[PDB]
Amino acid sequence: KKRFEVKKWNAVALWAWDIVVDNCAICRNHIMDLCIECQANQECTVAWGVCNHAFHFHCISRWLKTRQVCPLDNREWEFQKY
């Protein structure tokens, strides 16, 4: 017979990905690399989209030179969050 007993509880959570990102899928190097082209010849930053797809700036730029879609989801790519 506890003094107060809990009967209901409407908890609120906030799910987030355990790994935000570990690889730029144009160069197979992690996002904090120089995107291989900058590694050989030496600035280099990451870029994001609406689909939350982090890539190297130079990799996504050279992809967008001839293409206009995100490499992973194959939909229209536009810049968001630098």
Annotated binding-site residue numbers for Zn(2+): 24, 27, 35, 38, 44, 51, 53, 56, 58-59, 70, 73
d(CA 49, CA 24) in angstroms, rounded, equals: 13
38 binds, among another protein, Zn ion, none (CB under 5 to 8 A by kind): Zn ion
d(CA 30, CA 68) in angstroms, rounded, equals: 23
d(CA 25, CA 19) in angstroms, rounded, equals: 15
Q: 46 has which bridge partners? A: 56
Q: Which residues bind Zn ion (CB under 5 A)?
A: 24, 26-27, 34-35, 38, 44, 51, 53, 56, 58-59, 70, 72-73
Q: Which residues bind another protein (CB under 8 A)?
A: 2-19, 43, 45-47, 50, 52, 57, 60-61, 64-65, 68, 77-82
